[PDB]
């Protein structure tokens, strides 16, 4: 028989096991990365993938959506993002040793901008694996750069000096989103799905995208679209001058880097 008062008391303890599991994953290979190909829409494509974090326990695979609320509550997000960046650079070393010129796009949050461990991890790991910094691309949401601007600017200078590319995701939903860029010059912009999802059907979105790409190109800023799921979206992005696309129309996320770039 279900005892509700007993379940209520067992919760606190269920959370503690999760936290310990997360702390234990910060050490080893319990975390892993899967990879989503990011394809150049306009010309010869770089071998570029985006990394996605998973947690694996005895053959079970978990999305960050299973554990990120716990991680946030226990202030583990900055450590987790350091783990991903270290692992990614290790992967770039592995690819390079096998003859591949692979690039990886990785997510970091705004508390990484003032994390001295993040900057150190990037420098030290790139040197351990002999990876050129240009191979590592780091993305953070536009909204979070706005709210952490001064640390974002300092991070951007430190990391750009190592040749890594720093860019924004969830970009462009806002009146003149290009106005942040007067204060933060990114290597790339990934457009918010709110703009790109209905691009085939909403001229409202079609105008916003051409507005963004006409401002990006003359500044040499790359633009990118994600969740690209159909051919009419590809067609609209192509005409609007978007540089990169990713999503199920191109390729799913998976454990292997076996995408033939075309």
């Amino acid at each position: 028989i279900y005892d509700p008062a007993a379940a209520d008391r067992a919760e606190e303890e269920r959370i503690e096991r999760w936290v310990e599991q997360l702390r234990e994953a910060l050490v080893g290979d319990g975390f892993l990365l899967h990879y989503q190909p990011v394809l150049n829409l306009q010309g010869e494509p770089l071998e570029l993938y985006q990394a996605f974090l998973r947690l694996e326990r005895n053959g079970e695979m978990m999305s960050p959506n299973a554990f990120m609320a716990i991680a946030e509550e226990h202030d583990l997000v900055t450590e987790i993002d350091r783990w991903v960046v270290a692992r990614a650079i290790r992967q770039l070393g592995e690819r390079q040793r096998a003859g591949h010129k692979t690039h990886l796009l990785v997510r970091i949050g705004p508390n990484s901008f003032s994390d001295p461990q993040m900057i150190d991890t990037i420098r030290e790991q790139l040197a351990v694996y002999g990876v050129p910094g240009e191979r590592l691309w780091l993305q953070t949401p536009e909204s979070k750069v706005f709210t952490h601007l001064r640390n974002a600017q300092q991070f951007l200078a430190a990391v750009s000096a190592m040749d890594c590319k720093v860019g924004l995701e969830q970009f462009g939903s806002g009146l003149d989103s290009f106005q942040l860029l007067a204060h933060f010059h990114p290597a790339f912009l990934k457009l918010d799905r709110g703009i790109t999802g209905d691009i085939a059907s909403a001229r409202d979105s079609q105008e916003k995208i051409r507005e963004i790409t006409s401002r990006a190109q003359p500044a040499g800023i790359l633009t990118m679209a994600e969740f690209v799921a159909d051919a009419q979206s590809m067609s609209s992005f192509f005409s609007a001058g978007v540089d990169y696309v990713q999503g199920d129309f191109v390729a799913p996320t998976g454990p292997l880097m076996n995408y033939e770039f075309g």
Binding site: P4, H34, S63, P252
Partner: protein, 95 residues
């Protein structure tokens, strides 16, 4: 596969299936079939104290090879919050 279905006979089965620490709530669903993390799935869920089938358009956040199956995160719309509210109220012991 099409329509996923899960009927939970009793509160113990619910307690065991429910993911209380996922944003918006989630639930474990048995299925032998192959899903990828982030797939959108449609699930009809039946809860212990009623015959009403509750529709859930959720996202895959967990894969296991006890059972083979998927963890499904509820969406943030009113339909997702509704099903979460009903589960959490049940497991609190309430009418």
């Amino acid at each position: 596969q099409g329509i996923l279905s899960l009927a939970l006979k009793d509160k113990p089965a619910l307690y065991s299936a429910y993911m209380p620490f996922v944003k918006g709530g989630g639930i474990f669903v048995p299925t032998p079939k192959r899903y990828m993390l982030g797939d959108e799935v449609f699930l009809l869920l039946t809860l212990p104290d009623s015959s009403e089938r509750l529709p859930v358009a959720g996202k895959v956040i967990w894969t296991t090879p006890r059972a083979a199956g998927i963890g499904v995160q509820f969406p943030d719309g009113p339909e997702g919050e509704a099903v979460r509210n009903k589960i959490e109220t049940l497991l609190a012991g309430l009418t």
